[PDB]
Design a protein around this ligand. Structure first.
Ligand SMILES: N[C@@H](Cc1ccc(O)cc1)C(=O)O
Length: 411
């Protein structure tokens, strides 16, 4: 059980500072480590899973994860590797996002396992009331503009005026540096993990911790899954169905690394899967394993089963199993959707959903037996929907041909 050796085996270590010294330190016993997540939206996306779960593997190994939420950094904006200057967000909108993100972080870590039990942190606790002169004096002298401009993230923003960077976003690096120090002092954190794009910010904090506290602390970055639309963790931004679908459609190139980064599946099992797939008459079920594991992680069993149930209905044509909550996911993102007043005929439903272009055309297509209503074929061009077709009084699913869906949301 050399944690760093395993993480490397999983393809999880993008880079790491002073590796041998870190391996020894962990092997000596539990440490505290952190990773921080900024409130730049009301939810995390599938990308953040990598560092997040990585803290869970650290906690499974006896270590103590701190999950920092950027109450303060969210008011500022990480320019790291972004070509465009972010608009600032509202102080009231940011706190909204903070509590939300704190909340969705929490289920992935054990807050009640004794000593290595997890801790939520918010860097607003230290920046929220810090005087500007105090900041400039105690933290800002230890930073050199030269060294700052030369860091890889902000380097491209600085050549010359394709885009610029505000002094605000430039400041950002210092705040993440001080977070590290402040957490080293407060909780004895000695490792920070983060995505590969965060190296610079991590290293400034290592360096600053030397100068402030005379401790040695480590850096470790995990690789990105560049999915920022993004695949949101929030079921209301991205439905478990859609989430499951993203997963089950991971390319072959990616699926094995995503198995590694995104799931607690055994390294043994992940290899066995790969070696099987390559042999097995081109029978690749890794996506399917991938999908089920991560959906279950993120959305629980009930989310998994829903997404599978919704997947199975759109494949089969039979809607018998759908619940109302299942139509809501279809409505939110699962299939195209149209709102309609009750009393419209089929012909019209087909026009208003874009399945047919004219009433006259709809008529001929209905008559060629091309249209199903809730799975059951309907070929009477003059058909009016009846209450039975308004499932849960609200929902009707059209299909044209074998795979063109549109969901009718009745008002
Ligand atoms: N800079 C990180 C978030 C973060 C904020 C504060 C920290 O101390 C650490 C990390 C990001 O934008 O992804």
């Amino acid at each position: 059980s050399n944690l760093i050796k395993q993480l490397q085996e999983r393809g999880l270590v993008a880079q790491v500072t002073d590796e041998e010294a870190l391996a020894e330190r962990l092997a000596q016993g539990p440490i505290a480590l952190y990773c921080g997540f900024d409130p730049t939206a009301d939810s995390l996306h599938a990308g953040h899973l990598v560092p997040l779960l990585c803290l869970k593997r650290f906690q499974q190994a006896g270590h103590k994860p701190v999950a920092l939420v950027g109450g303060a950094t969210g008011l500022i904006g990480d320019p790291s590797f972004k070509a465009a200057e972010r608009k600032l967000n509202t102080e009231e909108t940011v706190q909204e996002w903070v509590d939300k993100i704190r909340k969705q972080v929490a289920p992935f870590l054990d807050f009640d396992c004794g000593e290595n039990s997890a801790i939520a942190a918010n860097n607003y606790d230290w920046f929220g009331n810090m005087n500007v002169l105090t900041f400039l004096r105690d933290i800002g002298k230890h930073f050199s503009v030269n060294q700052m401009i030369n860091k890889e993230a902000v380097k491209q923003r600085l050549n010359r005026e394709d885009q610029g960077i505000s002094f605000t976003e430039f400041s950002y690096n210092l705040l993440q540096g001080y977070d590290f120090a402040c957490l080293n002092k407060q909780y004895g954190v000695v490792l920070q993990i983060g995505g590969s794009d965060q190296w610079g910010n991590i290293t400034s904090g290592i360096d600053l911790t030397r100068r402030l506290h005379q401790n040695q602390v480590f850096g470790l970055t995990v690789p990105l899954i560049t999915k920022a639309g993004a695949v949101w963790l929030d079921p209301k931004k991205t439905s478990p169905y859609k989430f499951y679908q993203f997963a089950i459609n991971a390319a072959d190139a990616d699926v094995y690394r995503w198995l590694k980064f995104g799931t607690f599946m055994s390294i043994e099992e992940i290899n066995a899967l790969e070696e099987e797939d390559k042999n097995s008459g081109k029978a690749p079920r890794a996506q399917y394993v991938f999908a089920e594991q991560v959906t279950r992680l993120v959305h629980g069993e009930e989310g998994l089963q829903a997404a599978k149930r919704i997947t199975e209905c759109l494949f089969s044509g039979s809607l018998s199993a759908l619940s109302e909550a299942d139509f809501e996911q279809l409505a939110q993102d699962g299939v195209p959707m149209v709102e309609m007043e009750k009393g419209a005929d089929l012909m019209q439903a087909l026009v208003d959903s874009e399945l047919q272009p004219s009433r006259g055309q709809a008529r001929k297509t209905i008559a060629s037996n091309a249209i199903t209503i809730n799975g059951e074929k309907q070929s009477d061009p003059e058909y009016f929907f009846k209450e039975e077709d308004r499932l849960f009084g609200r929902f009707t699913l059209l299909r044209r041909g074998k795979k063109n869906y549109c969901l009718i949301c009745w008002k």
